[PDB]
């Protein structure tokens, strides 16, 4: 299974930004409350404007993630010197487009701008993670890290912005994004564990965790309120995720049979291989009409599982003559979560650079 064709990955679109006329509010606040000439801050305002323009039209590469984190930190610095939150003195309208409706949403709240930048940080990470072919340990490692970063951005957004400014950033939807991103990260790690030919039991646990993450995401997609909001998107996501649930259940039980093989339990080996074959056949049914990338991975895995099942049954029928335990006799594999939402630190000086408004008293 070292060279199994790579499954495709889901990514989220970035949000489109509208106006954020912070310049008049900062100049007004600077004169009124700091007693300084507002024109003395034209250079600082130019820098923040150039940073926002770069961040809202972020280059869809690795360096784009740094631009978003840098801008996010500078927004925290500004809010600590000029109050632009809800009901505060220098608050101005912030406008972004909501993903599912395509409609403009405006809030007079700088934390709404922070929230959208952090969503797009996770969205961009999901994009970069899904772009790679994962045929190199460098691209496999980068993709695994990207999906973990995406989970962390959405997780940070879920925790520190429980006021859902729009429905695409609501708790239930962000929870779906986090679980989906963690499943794809664990999936990348699974491909690595099978490349190294790690112990069979650990690979089973790693694949079983892929299943667990995708099962959590599939539950959210089957929620009627999530399905009505996502619309067609729920249909496309649920098709890939539901198939992957059975695909990686098959991979998990394939390696449980390998453990049974290593433990000289040749009747138990038949039971796990037959289970893996059944689960993979269900994944094949679920993959009708899916791209060739999915078909090529199922077909490769079928050659492995199908051959190993036939060989194991032949060995048991004519050599070992051991009892084949039922399906419901077997302890279910416990997933081994070896990925995590990588933390977001908004005011990390290494990611923000100097405070743009450091001279503002």
């Amino acid at each position: 299974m070292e060279a199994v064709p790579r499954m495709p990955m889901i990514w989220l679109d970035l949000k489109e930004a509208g106006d954020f006329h912070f310049q008049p509010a900062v100049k007004k606040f600077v004169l009124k409350n700091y007693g300084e000439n507002p024109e003395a801050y034209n250079e600082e305002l130019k820098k923040l404007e150039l940073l926002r323009q770069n961040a809202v039209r972020v280059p869809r590469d690795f360096e784009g993630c740094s631009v978003l984190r840098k801008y996010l930190g500078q927004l925290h610095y500004l809010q600590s010197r000029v109050p632009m939150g809800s009901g505060q003195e220098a608050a101005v309208p912030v406008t972004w487009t909501e993903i599912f409706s395509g409609k403009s949403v405006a809030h007079e709240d700088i934390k709404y701008e922070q929230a959208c930048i952090l969503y797009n940080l996770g969205a961009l990470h999901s994009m970069l993670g899904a772009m790679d072919k994962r045929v190199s340990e460098e691209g496999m490692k980068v993709s695994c890290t990207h999906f973990q970063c995406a989970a962390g951005a959405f997780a940070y957004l879920r925790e520190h912005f429980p006021q859902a400014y729009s429905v695409d950033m609501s708790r239930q939807i962000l929870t779906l994004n986090v679980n989906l991103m963690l499943g794809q990260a664990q999936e990348c790690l699974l491909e690595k564990s099978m490349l190294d030919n790690r112990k069979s039991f650990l690979v089973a646990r790693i694949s079983a965790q892929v299943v667990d993450y995708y099962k959590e995401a599939c539950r959210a997609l089957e929620n009627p309120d999530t399905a009505s909001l996502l619309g067609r998107i729920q249909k496309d996501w649920k098709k890939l995720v539901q198939m992957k649930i059975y695909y990686f259940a098959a991979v998990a039980h394939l390696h449980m049979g390998k453990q049974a093989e290593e433990q000289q339990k040749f009747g138990e080996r038949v039971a796990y291989f037959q289970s893996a074959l059944d689960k993979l056949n269900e994944a094949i049914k679920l993959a009708k009409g899916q791209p060739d990338t999915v078909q090529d991975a199922l077909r490769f895995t079928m050659d492995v599982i199908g051959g190993k099942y036939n060989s194991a049954k032949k060995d048991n029928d004519f050599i070992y003559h051991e009892a084949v335990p039922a399906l419901d006799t077997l302890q279910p594999v416990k997933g081994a979560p070896l990925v995590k939402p990588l933390p977001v630190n908004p005011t990390d000086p290494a990611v923000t650079g100097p405070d743009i408004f450091a001279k503002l008293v």
Binding site: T145, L189, L338
Partner: peptide, 11 residues
């Protein structure tokens, strides 16, 4: 062992 190598790889 196997886990520690894979855990460090994923960080």
């Amino acid at each position: 062992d196997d886990i520690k190598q894979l855990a460090a790889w994923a960080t």
